[PDB]
Amino acid sequence: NIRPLHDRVIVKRKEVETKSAGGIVLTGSAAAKSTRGEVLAVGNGRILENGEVKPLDVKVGDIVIFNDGYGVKSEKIDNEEVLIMSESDILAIVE
Amino acid sequence: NIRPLHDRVIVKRKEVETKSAGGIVLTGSAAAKSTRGEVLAVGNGRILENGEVKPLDVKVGDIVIFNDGYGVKSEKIDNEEVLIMSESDILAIVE
Amino acid sequence: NIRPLHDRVIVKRKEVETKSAGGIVLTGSAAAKSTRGEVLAVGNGRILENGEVKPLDVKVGDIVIFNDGYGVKSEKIDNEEVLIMSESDILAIVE
Amino acid sequence: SDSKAIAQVGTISANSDETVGKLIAEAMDKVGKEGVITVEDGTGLQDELDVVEGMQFDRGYLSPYFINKPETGAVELESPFILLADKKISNIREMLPVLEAVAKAGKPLLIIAEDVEGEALATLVVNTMRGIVKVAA
Incomplete structure (x- = not known):
């Protein structure tokens, strides 16, 4: 069991799609890494300048769209690759 | 259906116009990408320093003028390209 | 009819002067592009940290002196060049 | 215009070699009036004609x-x-x-x-x- 600190959220990307809009199977550089994931753990919240803390808007179990950058860290937890990433990099929540 | 977080806005750029103030059609690099769009979803609002939230000025259904930049991201939803970008990138709203 | 958001102002750049301080006509790169304009629309106001808005100092109908830079962007409305720029880029108002 | 005369001309022009004239007449008949015929080195001891349609x-x-x-x-x-x-x-x-x-x-x-x-x-x-x-x- 793992939980992040402050405003960090743990996500795992979905598998890259092979067939796209038909039976044509995409292999190579065309099959880019998926930018959608499943949130596993949620931090307590971001610390304000005043001192109080507010909860993160994303809840566990949601599907989120994010951007890969320097802030996203990939760690090999319990033989299962997951991403530890800040809440500011979460762009939208699917459904 | 997707919903943005905080001060982010989802838009789709309009189709590039071919005819240009006359019958002369433009093909290639001359016909630049459109700088106008249609807002689909509107975020909850920016987080203030104290902690309270303020709603965004753009409402769903408006036509916006925005500046393309490194912050604007394009995501494929429902086999359709859309732009996820912050409200600070909106320059003005037409009509 | 477009209205800017927050602290942005739309201006139209004045035509470059060719006849300079006498009969001499200037053509080429010597005639630098004009740095004076006419304000057409004014944003609601800049958003302070607390949450309240501050109305802009420039009023519609004024003549302004601005510094051209990466912040000033050019866009097309009614087949006429106008400049979308923040109110911080306006240096002074003439008369 | 007859293929017999074409064979005769090809025979005479090739130092009285009947086989060459027959081959050239057959090639001209097969390819047609608007086609092209080419001569190149072979591998065996006999002439062969290969027509591509x-x-x-x-x-x-x-x-x-x-x-x-x-x-x-x-x-x-x-x-x-x-x-x-x-x-x-x-x-x-x-x-x-x-x-x-x-x-x-x-x-x-x-x-x-x-x-x-x-x-x-x-x-x-x-x-x-x-x-x-x-x-x-």
């Missing part, structure tokens, strides 16, 4: 895995579609629409282009034997 150009398949009849080492396609791309094909992304349309139609495809880069070639060859589309380049 239709269009044929000296470019082969870009990848061995396109072969669907390994007995003769050749690629045979029935009622194909021909994509004539006067440009360099390097990225498969530009080809998804036509490939999807062809797969929906169900007929093979032949791509004649300036050249095919490794990415598009790999995608096409993967799609060939998977049973989705029949493609040669």
Whole structure:
């Protein structure tokens, strides 16, 4: 069991799609890494300048769209690759 | 259906116009990408320093003028390209 | 009819002067592009940290002196060049 | 105009060699008035005549895995579609629409282009034997 600190959220990307809009199977550089994931753990919240803390808007179990950058860290937890990433990099929540 | 977080806005750029103030059609690099769009979803609002939230000025259904930049991201939803970008990138709203 | 958001102002750049301080006509790169304009629309106001808005100092109908830079962007409305720029880029108002 | 006179002229012009005249008359009859005949070095001790009907150009398949009849080492396609791309094909992304349309139609495809880069070639060859589309380049 793992939980992040402050405003960090743990996500795992979905598998890259092979067939796209038909039976044509995409292999190579065309099959880019998926930018959608499943949130596993949620931090307590971001610390304000005043001192109080507010909860993160994303809840566990949601599907989120994010951007890969320097802030996203990939760690090999319990033989299962997951991403530890800040809440500011979460762009939208699917459904 | 997707919903943005905080001060982010989802838009789709309009189709590039071919005819240009006359019958002369433009093909290639001359016909630049459109700088106008249609807002689909509107975020909850920016987080203030104290902690309270303020709603965004753009409402769903408006036509916006925005500046393309490194912050604007394009995501494929429902086999359709859309732009996820912050409200600070909106320059003005037409009509 | 477009209205800017927050602290942005739309201006139209004045035509470059060719006849300079006498009969001499200037053509080429010597005639630098004009740095004076006419304000057409004014944003609601800049958003302070607390949450309240501050109305802009420039009023519609004024003549302004601005510094051209990466912040000033050019866009097309009614087949006429106008400049979308923040109110911080306006240096002074003439008369 | 008769083939007999053509054979006689070819015989006389070849130092009285009947076989040469007969071969040239037969080649002229087979190819037609608007075709071309060429002479090159052979391998055996006898003359042979090889007539090609239709269009044929000296470019082969870009990848061995396109072969669907390994007995003769050749690629045979029935009622194909021909994509004539006067440009360099390097990225498969530009080809998804036509490939999807062809797969929906169900007929093979032949791509004649300036050249095919490794990415598009790999995608096409993967799609060939998977049973989705029949493609040669």
